Amino acid sequence: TVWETPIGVKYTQSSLECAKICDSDARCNRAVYLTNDLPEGAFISTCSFNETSYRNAEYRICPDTDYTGVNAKVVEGVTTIQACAELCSNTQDCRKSVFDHINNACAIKAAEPATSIFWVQDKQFSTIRLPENIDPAVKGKWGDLIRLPVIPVAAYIVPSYPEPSRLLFFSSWSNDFSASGMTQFGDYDFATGAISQRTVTNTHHDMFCPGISQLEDGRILIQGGSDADTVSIYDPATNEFTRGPNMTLARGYQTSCTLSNGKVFTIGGAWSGERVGKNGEVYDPVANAWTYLPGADFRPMLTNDHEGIWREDNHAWLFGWKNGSIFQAGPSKDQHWYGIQGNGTVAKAATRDDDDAMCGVWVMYDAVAGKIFSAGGSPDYTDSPATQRAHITTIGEPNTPAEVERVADMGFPRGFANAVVLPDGQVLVTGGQRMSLVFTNTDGILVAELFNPETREWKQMAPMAVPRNYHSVSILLPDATVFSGGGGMCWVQNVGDSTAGCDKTVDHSDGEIFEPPYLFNEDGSRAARPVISAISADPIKAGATLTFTVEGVEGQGTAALIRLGSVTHSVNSDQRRVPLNVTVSGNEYSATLPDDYGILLPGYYYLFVSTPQGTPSIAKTVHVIL
């Protein structure tokens, strides 16, 4: 039984008497004789309670909320929201101010985006702001926080027909780690809003800190981690997990990559198992067998880290390429070619930079042209300032030099950011912080950045609401929007220990979705999406001609395949864009897939038809076979 204030607050002489008394007092959580939807402390994207205007220039007040961050001013005078508003009006460049109900003080928040300001639920304060004017045609648009049972520390799209509908995500034995043998998964149907959780135990696998690759049949191979030698295989068909063969060498914080021939290569992962650099290894799904590749030498790919070998072989930028080759774009200052021939091979490809970029963002935005875009990262895993440097790396024949062009610096240094490639081939960078500090919100960049390789120029997007630092994720949805989620997780010694001394402020058991500009016309209305009306649900093979019916476009539409995504620790080794050429005869479109499985990696892809102005369809799922 729960009374709900005129504003929207909810509690659990009288009883509505003290309850009324409690909602007078900014210092009252309990009373003897408060239970809102989101608890005190919770981050917000919108006022949870009823807003209020206040006046020749107007402000919107959200009660029972704080703006965390560097203040430009804190003044002990003010005793009314009115007066705090009045003071924000007389302070140059004040967009955000905070009234402290308990101490009668007005804070003016400092300037954005140089400062990072966060909107928290706290009954002790109220927030005052100057109405924002975001043109979604230029800056895209964020929806509101979607709350989740598990922090999405790792996440992947489930391959389904006609288009994927579900996002699986997962943490450790707990939803907010410690060899446990359990893994808490969340399940999010974004067709419906449906959100379930489960606990995966059959595999005897805590899948925290793993390699993730999508196989030919769209099964998801989840490798090592808290259980350093254990391997689980997720079958979309079953919606079940199966044990795979133990890896040959136990690993965590490694990258795996699906190859042209549908085997999976992994190298490094010194976080768990022995604390030593880790040589390469290849999984063959047909033989269902791991093979150790000693000549896949780890030494050439090490970073130099103040914390040592524990870190230096972590989170490798691996792309599966032509004739079963592996390109390693970083994060080591030097790029290399790795292979699975003999006892495995290694050779220098190029120098990307003068310093390492651990957990920088990387994506193959243009497979047919061998084009890779890198930005951000930091020279050491933690306690190191992030770089603004970004590069286009061009790869041709395996085991011959690569070309690196430095491009425009990002507007912000980002450590632990995420990147997705979009159907137009632009790369959207999200989250990360100015100084890589594991388990912190400190100086989280909220402003997303769109990089356009056509112009080799950056564009600052609308801000998201929650800092997406360490243990955050970015993945592409079938509607060509971007999910940004997670952040946090606590070190807990034993397994089953109760999180009471952990900092819950750094946990964000939630996500938020960004509409890029391309979903909007000049007037900020949603633009008219092509419809792929008809498509064979049939497997297709490299070199084949894909045929589909596109209704709802003014002019000749373009098309592109985006491989489905897997993501954790700023590593998405499964995403890649294959641009297609379209020949239009009627409303029936046809494209000849590339001849090379090094470009068209076996697996499930999004097909997108886009308007000539660059507005993409919802995707139809497309399965490439070997």
Ligand X SMILES: *[C@@H]1O[C@H](CO)[C@@H](O)[C@H](O)[C@H]1NC(C)=O
Binding residues are 253, 470-471, 569
461 forms beta bridges with none
Active site residue 589: no
Which of 470, 565, 601, 574 lies closest to 255, judged by CA?
574
Q: Which of 80, 199, 581, 583 binds ligand X (CB under 6 A)?
A: 581
Which of 257, 326, 252 lies closest to 295, judged by CA?
326
List the interface residues with ligand X, window 242-301 (CB under 6 A): none
Instruction: Determine if 478 is a binding residue for ligand X (CB under 6 A).
Output: no
Cβ-proximal residue to ligand X, closest one:
581
Residue 353 corresponds to which tokens in the numbers above?
């930079």
Q: Beta-strand (E) ranges in 279-339?
A: 280-284, 289-293, 318-320, 326-328, 334-339
Whats the size of the chain, residue-wise? Answer: 626
Min dist. Cβ of residue 368 to ligand X (A): 4
How far, in Å, are 349, 403, 514 from residue 396 at the CA level?
Answer: 11, 9, 34
Min dist. Cβ of residue 592 to ligand X (A): 8
**Beta-carbon count within 10 A of 542 CB:** 18
Per DSSP, the residues of 398-415 read TTS--EEEEE---SS--E
Q: What is the CA radius of gyration of the chain?
A: 25
Residue 208 corresponds to which tokens in the numbers above?
């925290």
Q: Answer left, alpha or beta for residue 11, where phi above 0 means left and psi between -120 and 50 means alpha.
A: beta
Q: Please enumerate, by residue number, every residue annotated as part of a binding site for Cu(2+).
A: 253, 470-471, 569
Q: Which of 186, 324, 530, 579 binds ligand X (CB under 6 A)?
A: 579
Min dist. Cβ of residue 533 to ligand X (A): 23
Min dist. Cβ of residue 594 to ligand X (A): 6
252 versus 602: smaller Cβ distance to ligand X: 602
List the interface residues with ligand X, window 589-608 (CB under 6 A): 594
3-state secondary structure of 254: coil
Q: What is the rounded CA–CA span in Å between residue 252 and residue 201?
A: 19
Contact pattern from residue 312 through residue 351 relative to ligand X, giving x for each residue in contact according to CB under 6 A and a dash for the rest: ----------------------------------------
Q: Which amino acid is at 149?
A: P
The footprint of ligand X on this chain (CB under 6 A) covers a number of residues equal to 4
How far, in Å, are 88, 92, 110, 326 from residue 97 at the CA level?
Answer: 6, 12, 9, 52
Of 156, 234, 283, 470, catalytic: 470
Asked, as a colleague might, if the bond just before 331 is cis with ω within 30 of 0, I would say yes
130 versus 582: smaller Cβ distance to ligand X: 582
Q: What is the rounded CA–CA span in Å between residue 466 and residue 587?
A: 43
Sign of CA pseudo-dihedral 554, 557, 563, 569: negative
Min dist. Cβ of residue 364 to ligand X (A): 14
Min dist. Cβ of residue 558 to ligand X (A): 10
Q: Name 55's Cβ contacts closer than 8 Å, sequence gap at least 6.
A: none
Residue whose structure tokens are 């990262």: 377
Exposed (0-12), middle (13-18) or buried (19+): which is 143, by Cβ within 10 Å? middle
Min dist. Cβ of residue 566 to ligand X (A): 24
Instruction: Determine if 368 is a binding residue for ligand X (CB under 6 A).
Output: yes
Min dist. Cβ of residue 543 to ligand X (A): 12
Residue whose structure tokens are 């089953």: 496
375 versus 421: smaller Cβ distance to ligand X: 421
202 versus 581: smaller Cβ distance to ligand X: 581
Min dist. Cβ of residue 582 to ligand X (A): 9
80 versus 581: smaller Cβ distance to ligand X: 581
Instruction: Determine if 582 is a binding residue for ligand X (CB under 6 A).
Output: no
Burial 310-336 (b: 16+ CB within 10 A, else e): bbbbbbbbbbbbbebbbbbbbbbebbb
What value, to the nearest 5°, has the Cα angle with vertex 392 and ends 388 and 396? 155
31 versus 544: smaller Cβ distance to ligand X: 544
Residue 75 corresponds to which tokens in the numbers above?
């003044």
Cβ-contact 73, 65 below 8 angstroms? no
Catalytic center residues? 470
Instruction: Name the site residues for ligand X (rule: CB under 6 A).
Output: 368, 579, 581, 594
